[PDB]
A paper describes a structure:
Its likely source is the moderately thermophilic bacterium Thermobacillus composti KWC4, and its catalytic optimum is 50°C. It is annotated as a GH family 9 member consisting of an N-terminal Ig-like domain and a C-terminal catalytic domain. The predominant architectural element of the catalytic domain is an (α/α)6-barrel structure composed of 12 α-helices arranged in an alternating pattern as is typical within GH family 9 as well as other families.
The substrate-binding cleft assumes the shape of an open channel. The interface between the Ig-like domain and the catalytic domain is stabilized by hydrophobic interactions, a salt bridge between Asp47 and Lys510, and seven hydrogen bonds between Glu4 and Arg431, Ile8 and Arg447, Asp42 and Asn395, Ala44 and Ala509, Asp47 and Tyr397, and His51 and both Gly396 and Arg398. The highly conserved acidic side chains of Asp147 and Glu523 are directly involved in the enzymatic catalysis. Glu523 acts as a proton donor, while Asp147 deprotonates the depicted water molecule for its nucleophilic attack. The carbohydrate ring in the +1 position is stacked between the side chains of Trp226 and Tyr519.
Author numbering: 1 to 543
Write the structure that this text describes.
């Protein structure tokens, strides 16, 4: 917990108690005694919960909350408390790199070069630039999740969210070491690039390799079958380039246009390479206005589908990010002609299937965007943020999730909503936005009905058996990874059995188990961790 922010312990049950005591563990002295709030039933969990509010106690230290016969696990009040998880989450991307050997003394993660054969991955179909089966260098980038596939939509959206974390607090990140393992990114490190930007560039370099000469971008790199729980160097099967999509082409353009701005102070040639690539993608999109999602039979036999057959929110982001980076007012005209609805509303949390908020954020920060339309976008952001505050303020776990939000990726959604609250705070400062965003980090780290952190390596309870082939094959804890979170819709054989056999039925906020095969709730992904990095950036102490 931070000294200057709200402090509530959430207690499920304990209906009969009326007071609580905050005890300094080092002295045994009570530093704060108060009355518990009234018990209130929580629809998503089935829990009856109340609060111990001790926000006025601000002294750093280690404490426990006593209620009746029980005392909480120790917790910290301190200014420094979110720096370590931020660092862990950010450097988890390094440990997810494809195409390199890793020997990390921090975690002990060690593996030989994985997927070197991505340097000659075979195109799964014929296109105007390559025969079916022709090799393409699509090496590098990050493994997506617990598998070894590499997918443009989540790679672009994750890279963009990490770049927005950079832009939120560049001076924090300039002095933040990710303890990059030996041999990695040696030219970038010799050049003094901040470690976060070194890591993001590994993914941008790969995204650039997924673009064809006409500007369009392929969908993903993977094999024809899912590997077992094996080290990446053991996954020697042929690799393929699959798919072609307009929404992924637009997401690439958004990420590359953002990277052009972010990298320009450091690497003028690389920044211009990114911008030219972004504009080639945008020009492909302007010349091919209809959505496309290419599907060849078999392309999902060994990798996730990431299918979206419309693309408006992503085309909007591409154009708005280009507007922000280039200051070319022709992009404002284009946006106003085709995407006026996104200038007047429809804010929703960022994820790979809807980047409208990345576009809205670019637009409101664009010097050459129309002023009245920037005002409209700010109001869309604050209306959405106000709704999140209303929900969370009345929720016993101070959660921005409703019972119907417990589907695949709920933990991402909590942190994406927290991200939206912080973007709203940037355009229209409001302490409630900042506090509610921080409440979602409290939730993520275990203040929730499932009684577990959804970030590895953090919390009294955390995921120990994430559906993750590197963790499983090396039996090595990688901290800072965010798993999907509770999901009442099923999707893997463990959760499917739990949900169908349970009587009474599982409450949605508890639809979670820590098991290797529970991949509908317990698989980490780069686009789950990315909004958590963004949110923690705001609350990490600088030095």
């Amino acid at each position: 917990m931070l000294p200057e922010f709200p402090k509530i312990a959430v207690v499920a049950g304990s209906e009969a108690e009326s007071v609580f005591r905050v005890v300094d563990i080092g002295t045994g002295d009570v530093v704060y005694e108060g009355r518990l709030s009234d018990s209130v039933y929580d629809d998503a969990s089935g829990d009856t919960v109340r609060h111990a509010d001790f926000g006025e106690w601000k002294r750093p230290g280690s404490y426990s909350v006593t209620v009746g016969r029980s005392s909480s696990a120790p917790f910290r009040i301190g200014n420094d408390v979110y720096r370590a998880p931020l660092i862990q989450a950010a450097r988890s991307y390094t440990l997810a790199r494809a195409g390199v050997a890793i020997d990390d003394p921090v975690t002990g993660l060690r593996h030989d070069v994985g997927h070197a054969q991505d340097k000659q991955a075979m195109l799964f179909f014929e296109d105007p630039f390559h025969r079916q089966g022709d090799p393409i260098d699509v090496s590098g980038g990050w493994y997506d999740a617990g598998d070894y596939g590499k997918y443009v939509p989540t790679g672009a959206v994750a890279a963009a969210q990490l770049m927005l974390a950079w832009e939120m607090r560049p001076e924090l990140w300039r002095s933040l070491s990710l303890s990059l393992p030996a041999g990695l990114s040696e030219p970038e490190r010799r050049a003094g690039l901040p470690d976060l930007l070194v890591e993001i560039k590994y993914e941008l370099d790969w995204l650039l390799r997924m673009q064809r000469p006409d500007g369009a971008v392929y969908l993903k790199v993977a094999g024809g079958a899912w590997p077992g729980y094996i080290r990446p160097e053991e996954d020697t099967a042929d690799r393929y380039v699959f798919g072609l999509s307009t929404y992924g082409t637009a997401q690439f353009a958004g990420a590359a246009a953002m990277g052009a701005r972010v990298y320009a102070p450091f690497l003028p040639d690389y920044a211009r390479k990114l911008l030219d690539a972004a504009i080639r993608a945008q020009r492909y999109l302007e010349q091919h206005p209809d959505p496309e999602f290419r599907y060849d039979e078999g392309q999902n036999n060994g990798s996730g589908p990431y299918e979206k057959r419309t693309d408006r929110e992503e085309r909007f982001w591409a154009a708005a990010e280009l507007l922000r980076t280039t200051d070319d007012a022709r992009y404002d005209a284009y946006i106003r002609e085709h995407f006026s609805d996104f200038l007047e509303g429809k804010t929703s949390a960022v994820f790979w299937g809807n980047t409208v908020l990345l576009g809205q954020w670019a637009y409101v920060n664009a010097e050459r965007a129309d002023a009245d339309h920037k005002a409209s976008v700010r109001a869309s952001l604050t209306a959405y943020a106000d709704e999140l505050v209303r929900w969370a303020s009345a929720n016993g776990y101070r959660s921005v999730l409703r019972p119907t939000d417990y589907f695949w990726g709920s933990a991402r959604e909590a942190m994406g909503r927290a991200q939206a609250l912080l973007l709203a705070d940037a355009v229209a400062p409001n302490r409630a936005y900042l506090e509610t965003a921080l409440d979602q980090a409290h939730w993520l780290f275990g203040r929730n009905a499932a009684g577990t952190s959804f970030m590895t390596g953090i919390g009294m309870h955390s995921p120990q058996k994430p559906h993750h082939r590197l963790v499983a094959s090396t039996q090595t804890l990688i901290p800072g990874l965010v798993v999907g979170g509770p999901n009442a819709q099923g999707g893997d054989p463990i959760m499917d059995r739990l949900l169908r056999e349970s009587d009474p039925r599982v409450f949605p906020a508890k639809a979670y188990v820590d098991d290797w095969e529970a991949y509908s709730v317990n698989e980490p992904a780069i686009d789950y961790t990315a909004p958590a990095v963004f949110v923690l950036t705001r609350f990490a102490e600088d030095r």
